[PDB]
Structure 1
């Protein structure tokens, strides 16, 4: 039914066996083989949107590998010219379904790195991700990123992060920043986000493990105003007895109820669980 809290899951759908994350070995990165993997990923994206419209999921995170190696210097064709018509069509479908699309580049995308080549590769991956959202016409699309490593000194790390992203107009249209379980708490991310003029994604599990001085309610109250559109929040539960921050197969009733009770208002909740669409 119709709830003020909308739900999503990331990358793939276990029920369908549909995924947006097919890739290949660099040795196999021919135009032919890449076009084949991309076509499968795009076919599965469509399957997922349609599944989501029937099963009440309004959010979906598209895998980084949708177009495998798109941002790699050896990518063999103009993927934007190849796919712009198809992405416009899929994006129109997603909007017609009232679905919100996002992307979450991985741990290796580090704009605050002091290594120029890591920065360049990271920005390339962000530009690909932002362009994809643009091609899909994802109005309120989200491109979620952690602040990355502290590289020995947090103040200089955050300075490089901001300085290396400030001129990235298209990336900043979608970018939102997320707290983590070790390095950057909600209060720290709010400061970074304010500097770049972007929203803050609160991750409930990361917050529980690294709360700083804030209860969940106050974290969410502070993060809410950073969004022009509906806030996005991440909900996960701890995979019992694994590394802190590892995601359980299914979110617990207790974590879901804690979030529901703490939310200051309507929001979009990305369920991060190994069970994907079965994760809540």
Structure 2
């Protein structure tokens, strides 16, 4: 059924054994082997889009390794010329299905690092991610990022984060910032996001562990105005008795309920659960 709240899951589908996330060792980074992996990941991207259209999922997060090692100085070919046509085609499918596409670079992507080498590698990775979403024609695509490390002093870490991203026209087309469970709350992310002119993704588990002064309801209410399009939110549940913020297999009914009650209006909810497409109902 057609709900005002659209759902998604990241990277892979467990029912199908489909993934967008195959990689390889850099010792095996041959033109032929990468083309191998990329092809299977693109095949799987397509199956997933089709499975989502038949099973009520409007959102999908494409894993970083879709084109394995694309941002790496040893990448064996022009991936954009190789794939532009097929990405446009997959992009048109996703739009025909009404699907919204996203990527979330890992915890080692840190534009606010003071190490210039980490900055350059991080920027390379975000530029590849943004180019991919551009080639898929993802008009409302999202590229989600945590604010990363305090590196001893937050004011300076944030100023580096903004300086190192303000110039990046293409990345800024898609970039949205997300609160975390340890270092940067929603009030903090809203400040960073305004400086950069980008939206805020509220994560409900992270919010719970690290709320600042804000009830979830006010967090969502402040975040909603930061999206020109449909706001995106993350939904996870605590994996019982494990490390705080560890993701449960399936989201609880109680946690789903609490978000539904807090949302100020229509939004897109990425379910971050170890079960993937089995993470809710």
* TM over 0.5, shorter chain: yes
Q: How far off is 1:243 after superposition?
A: 1.2
Q: How far off is 1:35 after superposition?
A: 0.2
Q: How far off is 1:205 after superposition?
A: 0.1
1:179 and 1:109 mapped to 2: Cα distance? 15
Q: How far off is 1:206 after superposition?
A: 0.1
Cα RMSD after superposing both structures = 0.3
2:45 and 2:208 mapped to 1: Cα distance? 32
Residue aligning to 1:12: 12
Q: How far off is 1:244 after superposition?
A: 1.1
Q: How far off is 1:242 after superposition?
A: 1.1
Aligned to 2:66, what secondary structure does the other structure show?
coil
1:20 and 1:65 mapped to 2: Cα distance? 7
1:243 and 1:134 mapped to 2: Cα distance? 37
2:117 and 2:173 mapped to 1: Cα distance? 24
Q: How far off is 1:241 after superposition?
A: 1.2
Aligned to 1:102, what secondary structure does the other structure show?
strand
Q: How far off is 1:261 after superposition?
A: 0.2
Residue aligning to 2:65: 65
Q: How far off is 1:40 after superposition?
A: 0.2
- Cα deviations by residue, 1:92-123 (Å, 9 ceiling, x for unpaired): 00000000000000000000000000000000
Residue aligning to 1:182: 182
Aligned to 1:114, what secondary structure does the other structure show?
coil
- Cα deviations by residue, 1:50-96 (Å, 9 ceiling, x for unpaired): 00000000000000000000000000000000000000000000000
Aligned to 1:42, what secondary structure does the other structure show?
helix
Q: Stretches of 4+ moved more than 3 A in 1? A: none
2:239 and 2:72 mapped to 1: Cα distance? 33
Aligned to 2:229, what secondary structure does the other structure show?
coil
Aligned to 1:144, what secondary structure does the other structure show?
strand
1:21 and 1:246 mapped to 2: Cα distance? 21
1:62 and 1:182 mapped to 2: Cα distance? 26
Q: Which 5+ residue runs of structure 1 have no aligned equivalent? A: none
Q: How far off is 1:215 after superposition?
A: 0.3
Aligned to 2:64, what secondary structure does the other structure show?
coil
2:175 and 2:25 mapped to 1: Cα distance? 29
Q: Which 5+ residue runs of structure 2 have no aligned equivalent? A: none
- Cα deviations by residue, 1:201-235 (Å, 9 ceiling, x for unpaired): 00000000000000000000000000000000000
- Cα deviations by residue, 1:167-217 (Å, 9 ceiling, x for unpaired): 000000000000000000000000000000000000000000000000000
1:188 and 1:77 mapped to 2: Cα distance? 40
